[PDB]
Structure formats: structure tokens, C-alpha cells
Design a binder for this molecule. Structure first.
Ligand SMILES: CCC(CC)O[C@@H]1C=C(C(=O)O)C[C@H](N)[C@H]1NC(C)=O
Ligand SMILES: CCC(CC)O[C@@H]1C=C(C(=O)O)C[C@H](N)[C@H]1NC(C)=O
Ligand SMILES: CCC(CC)O[C@@H]1C=C(C(=O)O)C[C@H](N)[C@H]1NC(C)=O
Ligand SMILES: CCC(CC)O[C@@H]1C=C(C(=O)O)C[C@H](N)[C@H]1NC(C)=O
Lengths: 385, 385, 385, 385
């Protein structure tokens, strides 16, 4: 039976550790894929980590230049949360250098993009058999969430971008059923820029918080109806959510151009006019991670917030982060539990290795008590190479 | 319930990437079988890659001389599509240096040939228990498809050859039910030569496109009734399908002897008088791969075609290719989806290693949009040896 | 359906070997987690070994200083009994440097503690989704059983300590249902000290035998009602159960301070006024292991006992040990079968390696005949390092 | 539902290859257990290979002196037929240096013997939970089949020996239900000697062909009722079954002492007064293997036989062999299919390594055509050591 997405986000107080996979530490000896862009997504029965392999293993020569990003060897695979991604425990999903996936209550939808920069095509699979295809409509690196899509009442939604990461690009919302696109809409968002959206269901509607890699130090958002009727904006808070970014100060309801140029995938959870913001601790690089609660922060410019919970110390590398959700049909709860994962990137460009890969940690909503700490990657580089 | 094969091939426009296993890249460190002659076959629930191991692992001494072809250690094993074939994820099927397999909707039929060149015997298994046996009737390397057999209405069909690869040989069609041969027929095809057939069901009948390793640059075919009443011919198109082959030109409805001598396993899909042709890009060696659509190409000698889609660049090694199909009982479709796989051979004779092995890619039918690219093997040789 | 804990312990005569995992021997080449604090726990269908990984593999550099105890990379994972714990066969459970788990007949409850010494928090999961949380209430290394909790009539019970291991600390019993704490009680036990309790169900009540790491050479106990109404005491027998300890002699019904200072996790089974005692063979170090039956030994100070069964020779390293139970709903028996496991610690501080890890053995109750022997770890150190 | 053993052996003509695991070849690089005493046994759904590990991996130092035989680290494990036995695919069964196992239609019965030579004890498990125990009754290496037990109508039967392998010993038949011994009988067989019996069901009764390691070049047998009413004898044929043995000649209905001293585990199938005999090709050592059909050979002394099928060349090492059966409830047949496996021993004492281990091949009954060949181990020694 299909996931009803009619319920609202769970009220929460802080974040409880959910998983840590230690995949790079383990990979020093074990047979662990070099990966990046990991994300977690759940069905009504299980939780899985998806990731983009480099079609190679840690500490092997084929991991050379894995800083690259796009290649024909890149594949989307998945394994159970918290396990190191290995050829011996990973299920193959799709050939892809950009991806998304989600479960609608019946089976898995995977979205894997491969092909040339000037004509990439997204292959959609429902339960592993191809059900549809979406070709680049601007010939400029068709790309998608790098985190789970969102399902409501048996329809699933994702966001894709085609165009320069460097300026105005084209942004589309897709609605799909049984892995087939049944409707799409191009956002009319001049001066906005959406990339790598973290989307979640909430009371029958989808809310996406994304990355402005053009000129936004705060994060852009799109929420929409099951009919793809949408609204757009940026997060107003002066607690800036992107990286790089300026020191906290007076924010804006539109793209804060100061330091907004490059960005990193992130997420945020909206509760009334407040936001739970996940962000790096560093202002310049992808270091540290922290959760911040600014009530009156989705709509106001206060650079002030109520609660801060440490996730990774400023002294340790982080990377991407994204939302994922646990539905009542899995949980037994009367609401939709907000969770998030963090990618811990090791290797190039920040360190002197021939390779780049990521570990993951994740945390879940929770109304009971919690604590801040540092759960860093933990591997010691360089490797045997 | 048994696969009805009564449906016709799906109308398609191009080919969507389905899988890539990266098995040789992974096998540089991981515990991956050295294999060749991989192929994909599906049931009503799953898709699996079958392959002929060399009873050894990449980058280990026992992979020496794995160019050989036939030995007592060769075994037919299988794993889920897209995973690297490893002793930790592979199901054992049969002792074999030539093989076929297919699912009838109820359980797997595997066909594994082993024994001496002068008296090989094919062991047939239904659901893993031996159900029948077929002995070499010409004492000269009994051998079979190296790709999936074809099932219709609870009967499965394969093709076998016994005799010289070098000249006239003997060709048989087998009909089997629950893994027992219930009828067979020797083709009366003087001047023809069939090897390594790719067979698929279409509207209650089987169509096989094969390899002429005697004197055919174009590909031989055999289609037949559930009663083993058959027709034979070659593909007429001047877009020659085999490798080696001459440059495209005026073809023939019989064996084009020019350059036809050695050959490579291949496939083709027939749509009316048109063909989807999969072939190497190179004329002299197993390099590159491409899909070509020549309407009026199954029956005519036009060296002209309508559409070409790149699969592997001319700069990269390929190898065998074969058809595989996805039935409605797995797909939900109202037709039989055509797919294909390509074997990417690395090592000897083309490269300076002690071993030979293959990776795989696969693609599926699809009525939506697609793109050409190059999805090559990607390993860098030689290995630690 | 929920495990009824209403049955009594099975009458037994000795102990039959149940499992041995050889994980350190295997780990000399294979990909085996460096672990410690293993334990076994069963459901109505299966038995699993849980363990605290160090987020690293044997014989790899990341196994350096794994003597440490508490770190952010420590995780609680599980695999089927008797298998070497590996990233390829282990299920991830929780991020944790202290843990417990148990199955209530419906699904698994896992308890994983992580965070800073001064504010650790226990994350409770039911069927893998977080259901509750318990924060350190004394800011001094919140910690728990390192062996299975106990379930009766759909409620599960565990014991936790917070405070100095060195003196008076605080001890709590928790009652939980579907992974949520529904009642707790702080023991009023001045001069007592409880750590690393081995708890088991017996006739609808829980009995825990624990470790006095303050001033007890004999073992402390707590038994309690489903209402958390409890009784406390020590094991009276002059066959002292802890390590270190004095030579056997006249015991006491309260903490025997002579040599009682440091301790080791252990267990015991109570039958009327008799005890089955598992203990090291050595008086000074964690060497050897043996099962001893002192009837009139739970309540009397006799240093005399009826039966002794050798489990590990004095010549070989041992370590922790703990109880685990097999319920009638798994067994078909009319009683609750007592079993136990032993941790065989190799490496630092006793041996000259950079690492520390453990193997396990386990034995089951049994009314038929048995024998004593020595089933030691078996690895030969140091390793390649 | 329980396996009815009421059916008779299938009529057969020869032997079709069923499996080959290549475990030593693969083990040169992969993580493969060093093992010996492998055997195959089937349920109503699957076939598994059981084996006695040495608690160590090929090509690792812990494989030193694995010629030994009995140690506390020896464990009985299992994996699907044809796969290399590895810590990543093997199910743990029992701690054991001698073993048997079989499935009764409902679940697995495993028998694992461990402990000291002077008091070994067999642990019986049904579905993995201990159900009974059998202690050495002569204090001289209690030991059992090293091949599958036999099940009929929900009862399972095995044979054990206690005493000298060197002279008169004590032999017992055990009947068990749900893994509990419900009856046993000591054979009154002065001058006979039974070891390592291969037992199979046939028309509601069990037939065992065994090893006389005292003074028998021909093989001893015991057949018996479900009531443990038994008959004994030796195989009369002058085609001697054991190894070592004399050249074929005039045989005897009793122990043929010439060359009968040491022996090897073997099997034979009885069809009326004829036998299918599996034996080494060599007369002096465990080299080669072959199947021979002597009708009028179970009861007569003719050194003449009708059919011989080669299994392993005289030039290659063999070892133990044993029967295994496939019941109608798994097969769909109206009879009980005879199969057999062969252990291919590599290393000490015959070769210059520090270790000893075995590969396996297996073959099944079959009424269709077959061929003889040589399917040898294939590993090249010595290893990296
Ligand atoms: C192509 C622009 C895009 C968004 C800025 O770059 C992303 C940045 C990345 C990064 O900043 O870490 C790595 C992502 N894999 C890449 N996405 C793709 C499809 O290559
Ligand atoms: C024996 C002739 C046959 C068909 C030409 O050769 C095949 C060619 C092969 C090839 O051209 O790649 C490799 C196949 N493994 C081989 N088949 C067997 C059974 O050896
Ligand atoms: C913190 C006191 C506690 C009980 C004495 O120490 C335990 C002793 C240990 C030991 O004696 O082996 C190692 C355990 N990992 C440790 N537990 C934790 C959470 O650190
Ligand atoms: C102890 C006598 C017994 C039968 C002769 O020896 C067997 C011979 C063996 C052999 O001849 O190969 C190895 C077996 N593992 C061994 N069985 C045990 C329990 O040690």
C-alpha cells in the first residue's frame, strides 16, 4: 500500500545519532567502493544508503583522479544504512553520475543520469525495470538531487537543473507515478538558482531546500502542491546556511550574493516560520557541521537563533548533507519524522591523495534528549595510495 | 505461472543504459572471478548475469593463461545484474565451458557443457537439479549460445553446434520442457554456418541471429515455430554485422565471404523488414560498439540506415554482445522488451597480460529519448600480475 | 507474539559447546572487524552475535591503539552466531561504545551509548528506528550491560551505571516496551557497586549478576519484579567469581574487598540456593575459564563446590563472559535454557601488538552429558601489524 | 512435511557432473577456509556443502600444520553447493572435528563432535538449537560419518565408532527424531570394522557402505530397518573398493586383509546384487577416481564388471568420497536419486606445503547419457605459504 504523505513533520527537540559507516577507515584494508554523493532513503520496511561509486575501490590504482565527478564508470548503488559500501553487500541500481531515489510504499524509484555533458539522460527505474527517460533540455549537464525524492499518495517528486552552475539556469519539478513522468513544470525563477535539492513531504505537499551555486549564501527553496503549483523564495535568516558564506549578520529574502558563489548541498526543515538549519561550522571550507534552530528564521532576518547542536567539529572535514524522512507506515508514528545525513569527504582537493571519497553519518528527529559531539570521518591519510 | 511468449516486440526509438558492473576495475583489488562469455537473462521477478568463470580470481596466479577457452575448472555461475562476479555473491549453476540459461516463468533452466572436445556433454538443470543430458553427436566441441535461451508457453528453445568452426558443421534446435528435451531438429543448411546464437521470443515464435565463423561477414539467422518448423537466411543489409567484416557496401542474402572468416558473437532485432543491428565500430578488431537501425535492412541490400547510436568508442575494447528480453509478466508492459548486453574483453591476445577477462554493460529498449556515449571497461592494464 | 518469560530455568548437568567464531585467526587475512564486548542474544527464530566494532579491520593501520575503549567510531553491529564479524556479513545497529540488545518476541531492541564522557546518551531502537533516549544523569560515563537485556511478557529490562567505576556510583534499572522506557528505578545500594550486568528472565522475574569494580571479589546481584521492585546482595560462595580475586576461602554475603578492585564482566545462574559460576581460571589475570557448580553457594560461605567443567585452559587468554538465554518459543522446551559466551581477548595490554580485539565461544545448558576441554582463541601474535 | 523415504533408488546409466567449487584455486587469493571432510546434503528445497574448517584461511600463517585432524578450532560450517567455502558465505553449524548432517523435510539436523580424544561428545542440533548429546562410550576418539545421515518417515539415522581405528572397535547405529536420539544399537560385528559410513535411504531402509581401516581392502556394509534391526557383510566383488588395496582379483564376503590396513572414506550403491562402486584409480595412494558398475558384484567374487566411467585422472589427487541423495520431495521424481561427491585433497602429506585442504566435485545419477573425463582440483602448489 502506498505511503500517504498527509501527515505533518514530527515536533522535535534535537538530533539523535542514527548511523555511522566508517567506510573510509574500513576501506584502508577492506574492499570498499570509492564513492561520493551518498544519501539515505527509507521504505515502509527498510532504510538504505544510496551512493555514486567511482567503479573502483579505495586504496587501489583505479581510484586515481576520483576527484573528477562525471565518468562512464560512475554507478548508483545501494546498501543497508551504516554498512560500508562494498561490492559484496551493495545492490546495483543504475549507471549514473547524478542520482535520486525514493520508495512510494510499493517499490523503489531510482533516477540515474549518465551520458555526455551536452546531452545527459536520466533513466528512471521502478522496481529495477526502466519505466521512463528524461533527456537534457539545455545541453548543459542535466543533474538532480543527490538525495531522496519525496513521495505523497503514490506520486513521487524530484527537481532537476540543466544549464550553468555559474549563472541563470533552468529548473524543473517532475511528478512521477510508477516511475513514469506524468507532469512537469519549469520554475519561473529569474535571479534564483536551484541545485541539489533536499525535498521532503509535509502535510501532502513537498518542500525543497537547495543550493545556490551562483550568487546565494543563503539557501533557495521551492514548495509545491501535488499539482506542481509552486512557491519560491530564499531562507531569510541571517544565520546563513550555505558554504562558503559570510559571517552571520543581517540576511535576506533573496539571494545574498556576498560569498554565495560556490555552495554545497544542504538541507533545512521548516516549522511554521522557524527553521532547523544544517550547515558547516566553517565559513570558508567544508569543515565541521552543526544543527541550528532559528524560530522566526524562515521569514525573518534575525541573525539570532535559539538552539545549536554540534554534529562535527570545525577541525574535521564534512561535505554534503541532505534530508531524509521516515513515514508513519514504517514508524508507527502519527507524523513524518525528519532525519538528515552528512557526507564526510576525504582526499582531494583538501588533502594530498590521488583520490576522493566520502563516509557518512546520519541523525534522526526525536522529542527526547540528545547531545552534541563530533562524529568525524576518522580515517588517517594519506593511504598506501 | 508460465511466461506466455505470445506478445510482440515493443516499439522502441533508442537504447537506455541499464547496467555496468566495472568488474575488472573492481577486481584490481577485490575478489572478482576472471570470466568471459557473460550474458543477462530475466525471470518474472529478477534479472541475473550468467558467466563462465575460469575457476580463478583476477590478479592472482591462477588467472595465468585464461585465454585458453576450455578446461575442467570452467564453471557457469550467476549473480544479480550490475554486480561484480565474486565468490561471495555468485550462485553456482553448472560445470561448463559453454552455456545457456533461461527462466520459463516457473524456474531456471541452465545448460552447461563440459567434458573432452571429442565427447562433450550438455547437462540441463531445472531449478538446479539435473533433468536431462545431451552428448556431442559429431565429436567436435559440442557448444551452445553463450546467451539466454528463449521461452514461450512453457517451452524453452536453444541452438547447439557440433563440428568445425572452420567449415560446414552440424546445427540443432532443441525444444525443452521442465529441462527435458522433448523434440530436436537438425538444420538442413548447407553453406550456412551457425554459432553462438542470440535467440528471443516474438509473437509465439523464436528468432535467432547468430555468428558465421566460417565465411560470413553478415549474420545468419533461424526463426522457428513451437514445433521446430524453421526458416533460415542471412541478414541482407550492406551494414555488415560481424567482426571482422568489409567496409559497408552492397550486402547479400547469403554468406558474404569477404572477411567473414572469424566472427564474434552478436545479435540483432527484427522489426518487419528492418533490423536493429549491434556491432563493433572497428572492421578488423573487437573495438567500439554501436546500435544501428536499417529499416528495410533485414531483406534489402541497401548499405544505408536511418539511425546510429554510439555505445562504446572505437578507441576502447569490446567483445561479445547478445540479446536478452524482458517479458510482460516482469514488466507490466503489453509487449516483449528487447535489451542487449556487451562483453568488454580485457587482456590477451590484444594486451600484455597473462590473463583474459570481461566486464559487461547492458541497455534496454525504450520508447523515450536516449543518447549515445562511450561506456568502456575502464580498467588500466597491465595488473600487478 | 511476545516472549512469555513465565517459565523457569531448565535443569542442567553441564555445558555443551555451541559456537566458536575464530574471528582473530580468520582476521589475519580476511576482512574482520576489530571488536570487543561481544555478546549473544536470541529471538524466537534466530541467534545473533552483537559486538562493538572499532570502526576498523584486523591487521590494518586503523586498528592502532584499539585498547582505547571509547571513541566516535565505535559502532554496535551484529551477525549470525559463530561467523567472523565482517563488513560483508554484519548488520549495523547503532553508534555506540557501550551497548545492550534483546528480542521481545516481536522485534529487536538495541541500546547504543555514544557521546562525550560527561554527557553520553543511550539511543534505544526498536526494529531499527529510534524509539527513545536516555542521557547521562551523573555526567560520568553512562554505560550499560555489554550483554543481552531480558524480556518478559512484552517488557524488556536493562541496567545502567553512571559515576566512578572507582567508588560509589549510581545504578538504575530500566523497564521498556517497544523500545520506550515506561519506568525506571535507582537502586538504593550504598556500599554496593554494579557494572556490566548479565541479566536473564526466570519465572517472570529478572536476575542480574554483575561486576563490582570498586571493592568486590565476589559478584553483586539484583533481581526484580516486572514492577521494578528489587532485591540486592552479593554471591556468598567462597568460590570467588570475579577477576582479580583471592584464592578460594571463606566468602561473604557482601563485598569482599580483598583483591576486588578491578574486576571483569561475568555471569552466574541461580538455582535455589546453588549457583552455576563462570569464572577465569587465573586469580590475577583474564586467563582460562571454567564452570563451577556450588549448590548451597548463592547463600552460603562454603568454599566448596560439587562440579567443575573446564572451558579454557589457564594457559590461554580469556576475558568477559555473559549469560544469554533461549526461550521456549524458539526452543520448543517447557523451560528457559541458560547459555553463556566467553570473550577471548587478544592484543594489548597483555601482548605486544598495536591493537586489541576478541574472539568468542559459547555453550548451552543441556541435561545430557558433556566434557571439559580448552577452546582458546587460537591466533598467533603479533600480526603483520 | 517430512521426507518419505519409501521410494526406491532411481535406475541410472552413468554420472552427470553436478558441481565443482574450485575452492583451493580461488583460495590462492580469495578468503577461503582451509577445510577437509566436505560433504553434500539436500533438503526438500536446497543442496548445501558441509565441511570441517580449520578455523583458518588458505595462504595464511594460521593454516600451518593443518594436516593435524583434531583441534578446538575445527568447526562444521556449510554453504550452497559449488561455492568456495568462505567466512562471507558460510553458515556456522557446530564446533566439530568430525560431523554429519541431514534434513528430514522440516529442518536440518547437524551432528558435531568436539572435545578430548578420551571423552569426545557429539552435539546434535535441530534447526540450530541443541537437542541432544552423545558422549564417547569407549574413550577413544568418538567419530562419525563425515557425510550425510539418512532420513526416512521423519526419523534420521547415523553411525558412530569409538575405539581403535587399528583393530576391533565399537560401532553404533543411532535413530533420532527432531535431533533427539530415540534408539541406538551396538553392532555385534566381531572381525568387522566400520568407519566413516556413507548411508542412504532406499525403500524405507538405510544402507551404509563404510571404511575398514583395520584389515579390509573391500568395503564393509550395514543395512537396517527403522527399528534398528540390522544386517552386516562386506562387498564381495573382486573389484576392490578401498585404498590402499590389492590389484583386482578374487574378492571375499569378509574382510580382505591384503592391503586393507589404512583405507579411505568411500561409498557404494546397491542395486539388487550389483554395485555402483566409486574408488580411487590408484592402488597405493589417493589418486584418480572412477565409477564402476559390477552387476552380480555385491554378492559375487567376479573381479569382472560391466561399465567404468572416469571421474578424475590417475595423475591427479583425490581423497574421500561419499554418497548423497536427492529425494522426490525436492526432485519431483518417483524415486530417490543417487549422487556422490569427491574430496580433492591438496597439500600434506603428499605435497611440500605447510597446510592441507580440499576441493570438491559432485555428480548425479541420471538415466540419460554421460561421459568420463578428469575434473581435478587444479590448484598449483606450493602457495605463497
Ligand atoms: C555541474 C555543477 C554541479 C553543481 C554546482 O556540480 C556538482 C558539485 C559538486 C561539489 O561541489 O562537491 C560535486 C557534484 N558531483 C557536482 N555535480 C555533477 C553532476 O557533477
Ligand atoms: C570452438 C569454436 C567456438 C566458436 C567459433 O569458439 C568460441 C570463440 C570464442 C571467441 O571468439 O571469442 C570464445 C568461445 N569461448 C569459444 N567457444 C568455445 C566452446 O570454446
Ligand atoms: C568505565 C568503567 C567500565 C566498567 C569498569 O570500564 C569498562 C572496562 C573494560 C575492561 O575492563 O575490559 C572495557 C570496557 N569497554 C569499559 N567500558 C567503557 C564504557 O569504557
Ligand atoms: C581417528 C581414526 C580416523 C579413521 C581411521 O581417522 C580419520 C582418518 C583420516 C584420513 O585417513 O584421511 C582423517 C580424518 N579426519 C580422521 N578422522 C578423525 C576424527 O580424526
Amino acid at each position: 500500500v502506498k505511503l500517504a504523505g498527509n501527515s505533518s513533520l514530527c515536533p522535535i527537540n534535537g538530533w539523535a545519532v542514527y548511523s555511522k559507516d566508517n567506510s573510509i577507515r574500513i576501506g584502508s584494508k577492506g574492499d570498499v567502493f570509492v564513492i561520493r554523493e551518498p544519501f539515505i532513503s527509507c521504505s515502509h520496511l527498510e532504510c538504505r544508503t544510496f551512493f555514486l561509486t567511482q567503479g573502483a575501490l579505495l586504496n587501489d590504482k583505479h581510484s586515481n583522479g576520483t576527484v573528477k565527478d562525471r565518468s562512464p564508470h560512475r554507478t548508483l548503488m545501494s546498501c543497508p544504512v551504516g554498512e560500508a559500501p562494498s561490492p559484496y553487500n551493495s545492490r546495483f541500481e543504475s549507471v549514473a553520475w547524478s542520482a535520486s531515489a525514493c520508495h512510494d510504499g510499493t517499490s523503489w524509484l531510482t533516477i540515474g543520469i549518465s551520458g555526455p555533458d551536452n546531452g545527459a539522460v536520466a533513466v528512471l527505474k521502478y522496481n529495477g525495470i526502466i519505466t521512463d527517460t528524461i533527456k537534457s533540455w539545455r545541453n548543459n549537464i542535466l543533474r538532480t538531487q543527490e538525495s531522496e525524492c519525496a513521495c505523497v499518495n503514490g506520486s513521487c517528486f524530484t527537481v532537476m537543473t540543466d544549464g550553468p552552475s555559474n549563472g541563470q539556469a533552468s529548473y524543473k519539478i517532475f511528478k512521477m507515478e510508477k516511475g513514469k513522468v506524468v507532469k512537469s513544470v519549469e520554475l519561473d525563477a529569474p535571479n534564483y538558482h536551484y541545485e541539489e535539492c533536499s525535498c521532503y513531504p509535509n502535510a501532502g505537499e513537498i518542500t525543497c531546500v537547495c543550493r545556490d551555486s551562483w550568487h546565494g549564501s543563503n539557501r533557495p527553496w521551492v514548495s509545491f502542491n501535488q499539482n506542481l503549483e509552486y512557491q519560491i523564495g530564499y531562507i531569510c535568516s541571517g544565520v546563513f546556511g550555505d558554504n562558503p558564506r559570510p559571517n552571520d549578520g543581517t540576511g535576506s529574502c533573496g539571494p545574498v550574493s556576498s560569498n554565495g558563489a560556490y555552495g554545497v548541498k544542504g538541507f533545512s526543515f521548516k516549522y511554521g516560520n522557524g527553521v532547523w538549519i544544517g550547515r558547516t561550522k566553517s565559513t570558508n571550507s567544508r569543515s565541521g557541521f552543526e544543527m541550528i534552530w532559528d524560530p522566526n528564521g524562515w521569514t525573518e532576518t534575525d541573525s539570532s537563533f535559539s538552539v545549536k547542536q554540534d554534529i562535527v567539529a570545525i577541525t574535521d572535514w564534512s561535505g554534503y548533507s541532505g534530508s531524509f524522512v521516515q513515514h508513519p507506515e514504517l514508524t508507527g508514528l502519527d507524523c513524518i519524522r525528519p532525519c538528515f545525513w552528512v557526507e564526510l569527504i576525504r582526499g582531494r582537493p583538501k588533502e594530498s591523495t590521488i583520490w576522493t571519497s566520502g563516509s557518512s553519518i546520519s541523525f534522526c528527529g526525536v522529542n527526547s534528549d540528545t547531545v552534541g559531539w563530533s562524529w568525524p570521518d576518522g580515517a588517517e591519510l594519506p593511504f598506501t595510495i
